[PDB]
Symmetry: C2
Subunit: 208 residues, 2 copies
Amino acid sequence: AEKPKLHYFNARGRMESTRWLLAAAGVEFEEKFIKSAEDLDKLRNDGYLMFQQVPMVEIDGMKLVQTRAILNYIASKYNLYGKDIKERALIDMYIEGIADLGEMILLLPVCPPEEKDAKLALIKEKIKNRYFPAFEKVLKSHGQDYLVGNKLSRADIHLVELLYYVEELDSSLISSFPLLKALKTRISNLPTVKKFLQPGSPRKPPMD
Amino acid sequence: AEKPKLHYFNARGRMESTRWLLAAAGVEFEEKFIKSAEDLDKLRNDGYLMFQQVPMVEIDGMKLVQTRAILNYIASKYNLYGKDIKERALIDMYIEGIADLGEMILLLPLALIKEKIKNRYFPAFEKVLKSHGQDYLVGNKLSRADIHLVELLYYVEELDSSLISSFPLLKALKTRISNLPTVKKFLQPGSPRKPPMD
């Protein structure tokens, strides 16, 4: 059960959703920071990156690249991917909706400054009219504690992670969604997650 | 015993990789084409799209959206996703590199695009075939990675026919998959396969 090793920069970027899932499942890990174009060159030049890029994760004797491959393997290994291929399809539809919204928030600060005001405007519109309504409807339809199978899964974790970034954006956006508000609370109080949210954890700060 | 129903435009777009995978697996399906903005308004008001967008596929009692959710279900049902958890990780790594390179090409409607091909993606898949010398990418058995890579090989071609020239094992994988009976039927005229944009 040796430790998985995360290779990335000292930032949120494309490694942060992997930090959140390993911690919620209670696994302990080490990180390898990248601080220069020289270290990035020795990984590459040493044959560690199949497509010459990070993120990279060493686990169970492998060297994986691509965020979605890293996340799907961990979720299976720790039983966080539902019980059968029909549960996985519901889970897959929900989390890809969440990654579509996350990616726009993620690239927002690299947009052209002359294009910045309209892109932001467009992202709260979708949050309000498309994505937040869709997930409140899911929880209302069955009235249960979790999004799928009445049991904790990766979908609850990736959703709650996104709710925090939205709050940093505009804390009024979640108001009219009381079922979402309460999920955020119940998940943030699980022992493994409450720790990861406490000061001193491997959680990383905004991309100042 | 009802067949899968695919809802999209009459074009390649974001439904074509799904067209390839079901045909390769021998599955007959139906298509309902979107041919006017009002067609798409009725799909929304009747409540068939969880996030108000297509593609959407009806299958085994459910309505699925998001291309990656749709493809993962189909690949597991017809045993084209590996035999265990580690075979699945090599397959996900390969096909998301492929979905990366294909995304750039799809939105194209380049020098950069041509450099990455010749120096990043094609040398990486030639290395994989050379490492074990077998006729398929993973587990010595036909998988979704083989189908998605060959579809891409056909698009890269339309762009520039000399890009593949220095990659002998890729040319040969292209030849053998195309000769599979389900796949050769799909490349023949009269199939659901779609033409390039014009």
